[PDB]
DNA sequence: AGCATTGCTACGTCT
DNA sequence: ACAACGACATATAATTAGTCACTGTACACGTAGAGACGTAGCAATGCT
DNA sequence: ATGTACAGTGACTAATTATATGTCGT
DNA sequence: TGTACAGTGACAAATTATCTGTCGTC
């Protein structure tokens, strides 16, 4: 086994210069006498030299320097009272208790009295011996992980399964994340940090869309991702903007947290109705494709405006509520500007000879179809397993509803698609050679002079029957119509269709 | 070490000039919000 | 601040006073540290000081009740913290110098 | 150095035996928690 | 030598630094140096400086800054000591004890 | 007669 | 031959174990829990 | 003039004891 | 083969402070 002498000293080096004035060769009887000069030059007698020279020429550089002693590391306590600390020390700190070297020479010295021991472990041998311990745990505690690195990637799946990721949205990603920036209504209260949730294409490691929002992570929150993710862009001239968000078309795979809306029926329906398959993650950490742009966009973004809270509680700048100061009309274009400006343009970190967006350009297995707005709005969230009556009727979540086409049938098992924020009128869906096919579009009975969405229905539905009002659409409509989420769902009625 | 130099070259090659405007207007967009009081 | 304290005080024969801020609590907010360390910490449950800090499985260990609790910071206080000696004398046991 | 010491010299005197049994028997009580 | 510590940037660019990153951690903006170099180049490219200050001197620039906003978190406290003691009222009266 | 569907309430369970 | 590795007993000195006076630092109400979406309890309002 | 005060630290020092030395040895 | 950006070490390029000559009368 090859070991290398380190740490070469001063007095090494007088030792060693002496060594190589003698590695010179001569006949051996005057080599016993030229080493005679070592003698006062060492002040010890040729005897230390012959050692010396028996020591040089077995063990080089290693064992011309001295050792350690045999007993560095070892504790003269012996091995009772080392064991006894470290067995203390180890099983006081498992769960969730947390012992402290303090605390174990406190046993070490109860113990002794116990023992009768006239001299047990100091404190500070105590805290000595678990000095590896420590250290030892905390290089467990921060280890670098590779990452991977080229083109070819795969990511773990919570099916155990691994699947390649294999060009441009093969396998997009989302997840969301609470925004570091309190920001405010319409000349401005305080009102609370919104959520962020991005869809992320794991080949490019590009972004296609974003929801920005204080709706909490929810299926119509994801789905409205998709809806911005999946359709072409056009931002208004009032952005200003420099690139276009060319990103658009379809997944064929949708890798994500395993969230309840993630995990939703709704979103399973979209899988169905737009051919992709969704994958759950397994731990967080193959996740990082999206985690990490939180953290990116944290410190490039957030950080730098007026709301910003912080990345804990622990870290949490007092002057955020005090002079938060965005409204999220701006946040939505700062945060737009950055990824559309910068972060499409944004080298990609493994592989440098390329932006974000030209290894989605380039990478994309073949030029998607653009697919018609209309058709991820029939992409609806859906009921089933209800009836349509008997007659040119129909009924919801205690509305009540017309249909132009439903009498031609009988009291059967029907299909329902909805729009959550437009309850005004349902699509209808029928199971002919056991498909789906379209009954007709369907209106609440008299409902035209107004629009109404499902959220302010639901609510209204709790105050109708706890009043003992007479059940029906039209009393259920009053006690919608006769705040923190008043103001959040106002702010965010601000939206592009009228503004494109 | 050639090699490492076509990576850190091909970076170098961005064409930032124009990504900047971000970051001088979402400071002006930040300073032309003032107090509520 | 309720009027139901200094009514006890008017009764009792008190004044109550406030501090300025927190430093000058310090002789009241030090013996919680030194309850959190020499006591809460070495429990079943100790959910540790911080949210970046509390144990992984706080919940999972918590498995102590209130009587039990009262009962070890009963032992603590009277065969332990009171007995130490006062940090600025060094010759008195807190009680000694009560 | 003679005052520190007189301090130090003092607080070696303090009988930690109430002190002391009670860490034990702290110990030995939560040697019955189960969760 | 006497131009150890001292930058060769020059006052303009020693107060540009130093006037960015510190209006950029007032409030809860947290800017960190390496947003004030990308206010650097932004800066040097419309003043038509084709010389802009590299992010290691912008770093160092700051090393003392940091290091000054540091230390206020270590300052220790005396403390009270012997017998003497009283405590100090909102009322602005140190009762003693 | 028969249930049969429709609109709430957990009790998790997950981020 | 006598310069090669032993046989010491005794220094030599580099290990550990222990004493102390210093000092950093958290004690300052605070995450158990909001807020989604099932599988499964239910009632009800229908009706044949 | 003075927040609090305990656990962990450093800078030695007393005791251990690993092993270098000087002489003889064959 | 998680992700990957801001901060940092070791070094070269450039600047420039100042210290080393050969010197002159003191
Ligand atoms: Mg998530």
């Not at chain 1, 490691?205 to 929150?221: E, Q, Y």
């Amino acid at each position: 086994k090859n070991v290398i002498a380190t740490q070469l000293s001063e007095e090494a080096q007088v030792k060693l210069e002496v060594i190589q004035s003698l590695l010179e060769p001569c006949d051996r009887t005057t080599y016993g006498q030229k080493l005679r000069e070592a003698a006062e030059k060492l002040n010890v007698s040729l005897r230390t030299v012959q050692r010396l020279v028996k020591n040089w020429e077995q063990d080089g550089l290693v064992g011309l320097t001295q050792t350690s002693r045999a007993d560095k590391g070892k504790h003269r306590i012996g091995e009772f009272w080392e064991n006894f600390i470290t067995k203390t020390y180890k099983e006081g700190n498992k769960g969730s208790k947390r012992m402290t070297p303090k605390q174990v020479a406190l046993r070490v010295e109860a113990k002794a009295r116990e023992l009768k021991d006239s001299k047990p472990p100091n404190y500070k041998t105590v805290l000595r011996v678990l000095a590896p311990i420590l250290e030892k745990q905390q290089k467990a505690k921060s280890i670098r992980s590779p990452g991977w690195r080229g083109t070819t990637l795969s990511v773990k799946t919570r099916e155990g399964k691994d699947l390649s990721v294999d060009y441009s949205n093969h396998v997009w990603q989302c997840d969301h994340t609470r925004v570091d920036v309190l920001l405010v209504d319409q000349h401005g209260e305080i009102l609370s940090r919104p959520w962020l949730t991005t869809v992320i294409d794991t080949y490019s490691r590009c972004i296609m869309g974003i929801n920005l929002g204080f709706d909490a992570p929810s299926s119509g929150v994801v789905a409205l991702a998709l809806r911005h993710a999946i359709l072409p862009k056009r931002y208004g001239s009032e952005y200003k903007l420099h690139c276009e968000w060319g990103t658009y078309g379809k997944p064929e795979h949708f890798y994500t947290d395993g969230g309840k809306d993630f995990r939703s029926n709704h979103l399973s329906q979209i899988g169905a109705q737009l051919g992709f398959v969704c994958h759950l993650r397994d731990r967080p950490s193959e996740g990082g494709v999206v985690e990490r742009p939180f953290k990116t966009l944290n410190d490039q973004l957030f950080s730098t405006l007026p709301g910003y809270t912080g990345s804990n509680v622990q870290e949490r700048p007092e002057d955020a509520e005090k002079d938060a100061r965005l409204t999220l009309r701006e946040l939505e274009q700062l945060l737009v500007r950055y990824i559309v400006d910068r972060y499409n343009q944004s080298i990609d970190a493994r592989m440098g000879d390329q932006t974000r967006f030209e290894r989605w350009e380039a990478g994309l297995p073949t030029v998607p179809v653009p697919i018609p707005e209309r058709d991820l709005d029939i992409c609806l969230m859906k009921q089933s397993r209800r009836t349509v009556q008997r007659g040119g009727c129909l009924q919801f979540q205690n509305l009540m509803y017309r249909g132009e086409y439903l009498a031609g049938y009988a009291g059967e098992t029907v299909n329902l698609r909805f729009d959550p924020r437009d309850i005004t009128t349902i699509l209808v869906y029928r199971q002919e050679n056991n498909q789906e096919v379209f009954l007709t579009r369907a209106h609440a009975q008299g409902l035209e002079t107004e629009q109404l969405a499902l959220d302010e229905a639901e609510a209204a539905s709790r105050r109708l029957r706890t009043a003992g009002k007479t059940i029906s659409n039209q009393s259920l409509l009053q006690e919608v119509v006769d705040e923190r989420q008043k103001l959040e769902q106002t702010v965010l009625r601000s939206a592009a269709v009228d503004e494109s | 070490e050639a090699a490492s130099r076509r990576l850190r070259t091909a970076g170098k090659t961005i064409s930032n000039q124009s990504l900047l405007q971000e970051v001088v207007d979402r400071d002006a967009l930040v300073a032309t919000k003032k107090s509520r009081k």
